[PDB]
């Protein structure tokens, strides 16, 4: 009927972290939630050219408005569970983000359902691979602008990426 | 360097709170030092009591509070897992209770950053006066303000929870 401080901590980490539906966390890189992904007017207003859905649903498929908005789309199916292997998506998502930003005027929304875990993981991987931030560095840069908390398993995967990169 | 558990605390403690204070319970605002110094906001919100869980004894009661009629209790706590907040649980929950028992009463419980020292007394108040368990108190508050008491305060609230629930 009682717990230890570690389980309390895990519960506390499910508290409020997100303040807006999306935040620019890197020049031209917005990180946000499903609402922003479905907000045609805001996607219009912000000049969104690429969308990376890190929570792609085979049921809902590619949002129908993105064609009318000129949006290049990449959905990856992913589940926000410490047991899920998000690393299968690191390089394909990073490359996508790189070529979105590489384009003059390019602007990308990376999103999940909440915008704090699946999506945040791929952004942090993108900064590690393409800008050579440490895992801790990328976390500090992103959390300056959006309260992120990748699940424990995604953090363990990002730590392993951090290890492998810093060696080579 | 940093293990995953350290990465978690860095992410969740080092985020930027959406607001300088949040109503986490009816008439109970939990927030930071900025809000404590925000005369405009204090008046707009109708704050009638302030509990400074980060009180320094060489500053007194904030001077502006008397003219506003704001009643003050300062708790001289440090945000350290070695600091025993438990000796203040009751005196703090009492003050909060009197504030909220007053018609129109509204309290600001604050600390430096509004995540640990102040949050700890808010949780203790909810357990003592509304008989919530620690976990219930946390679920009540966490979606309004992303609190995270330091591990030692969590241990002292676990001690309280067990005592109150025999």
Residue numbers in the entry:
A (entry chain B): 41 to 208
B (entry chain A): 42 to 207
What did the authors write?
In this study, we determined the crystal structure of a catalytically active form of DUSP26 with an N-terminal extension (residues 39–211, referred to as DUSP26-N) at 2.0 Å resolution. To gain insight into the structural basis for the catalytic activity of DUSP26, we determined the crystal structure of a catalytically active form of DUSP26, DUSP26-N. Because the active site cysteine of the phosphatase with a low pKa value is susceptible to oxidation, we mutated the active site cysteine (Cys152) to serine, which does not affect the structure or substrate binding, for crystallization. As shown in the structure of DUSP26-C, the DUSP26-N (C152S) monomer contains a central twisted five-stranded β-sheet (β1-β5) sandwiched by two α-helix bundles. Despite their close resemblance, the most noticeable difference between DUSP26-N (C152S) and DUSP26-C lies in the presence of an additional α1-helix in the N-terminus of DUSP26-N (C152S). By contrast, similar to VHR, the DUSP26-N (C152S) monomer adopts a “fold-back” conformation of the C-terminal α8-helix, which is packed against the catalytic core from the same subunit to form a four-helix bundle. Structural comparison with the catalytically active VHR and catalytically inactive DUSP26-C and MKP-4 showed that DUSP26-N (C152S) adopts a canonically active PTP-loop conformation, which is highly similar to that of VHR. Unlike those of DUSP26-C, which are flipped away from the active site, the backbone amide atoms of Val156 and Ser157 in the PTP loop of DUSP26-N (C152S) are pointed into the active site pocket. Together with the backbone amides of residues 153–154 and the guanidinium group of Arg158, they generate a positive electrostatic potential, which is crucial for the catalytic reaction of the cysteine thiolate anion. In the DUSP26-N (C152S) structure, the canonically active PTP-loop conformation is stabilized through formation of hydrogen bonds with the surrounding α7-α8 loop: Gly155-Arg186, Val156-Ile189, Val156-Pro190, and Ser157-Asn191.
Dual-specificity phosphatases (DUSPs) are a group of protein tyrosine phosphatases (PTPs) that can dephosphorylate both phosphoserine/threonine and phosphotyrosine. Despite their various substrate specificities, DUSPs exhibit a conserved catalytic mechanism mediated by a catalytic triad consisting of a Cys, an Arg, and an Asp in the active site and a phosphate-binding loop (PTP-loop) with a “HCxxGxxRS(T)” consensus motif. As an atypical DUSP family member, DUSP26 consists of an N-terminal domain (residues 1–60) as well as a conserved catalytic domain (DUSP26-C, residues 61–211). DUSP26 dephosphorylates pSer20 and pSer37 in the p53 transactivation domain (TAD) to inhibit the p53 tumor suppressor function and thereby results in the chemoresistance of neuroblastoma cells to doxorubicin-induced apoptosis.
